[PDB]
């Protein structure tokens, strides 16, 4: 047998391919499970670990988003930006992005710590990456976020139905 969530994911994929956006969104809302399509989960983890956050942010924009994983990921990307001394970009991301606004609202202290870190004239990596390494943070973020995402072949439902027709045609159905 197969889990309902998987079948609903197949349906949602079909809806996406058939350009039925409204029914797709309404479905995802009602059943509270969302399709999160990626070419490869390993490739996704690779993208997160390597440090290519433009792509990762693209994928993030594509999928259904939890606020917590968002504020975590965006926080880490903020620290990565302030490390590379892209102060303007980091401040703009911290100010003008939705998960960062949510973080600012819910926890003023955390946002204050991030802004304080950005305001510093130099990047003090010893303590922040001393407590937990960059590689480890990237690793846990990649793991938790990737476990949320799924991988499914294009027109999976149709192919499956084709297999069903092949079954009926060449093997046959049960007599009663």
């Amino acid at each position: 047998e197969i889990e309902s969530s998987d079948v609903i994911r197949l349906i949602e994929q079909f809806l996406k391919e058939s350009n039925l956006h409204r029914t797709l969104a309404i479905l995802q809302e009602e059943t509270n499970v969302s399709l999160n399509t990626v070419d490869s989960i390993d490739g996704f983890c690779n993208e997160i670990t390597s440090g290519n956050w433009d792509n990762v942010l693209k994928t993030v924009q594509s999928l259904k988003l939890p606020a917590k994983k968002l504020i975590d990921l965006y926080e880490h990307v903020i620290i990565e930006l302030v490390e590379l001394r892209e102060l303007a970009t980091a401040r703009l991301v911290a100010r003008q992005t939705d998960p960062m606004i949510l973080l600012k609202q819910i926890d003023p202290d955390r946002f204050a710590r991030l802004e304080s870190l950005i305001n510093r004239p130099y990047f003090d990596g010893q303590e922040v990456y001393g407590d937990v390494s960059k590689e480890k943070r990237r690793s846990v973020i990649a793991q938790t976020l990737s476990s949320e995402v799924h991988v499914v072949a294009p027109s999976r439902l149709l192919s499956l139905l084709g297999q069903s027709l092949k079954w009926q045609l060449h093997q046959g159905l049960l007599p009663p």
Binding site: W53, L57, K58, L81, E86, T89, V93, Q96
Partner: peptide, 18 residues
């Protein structure tokens, strides 16, 4: 309206601000 330093920076800026 897009400050371009690193390629990943200008691209992430492109994505987040559009």
């Amino acid at each position: 309206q897009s400050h371009s330093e690193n390629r990943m920076v200008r691209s992430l800026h492109r994505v987040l601000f559009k």
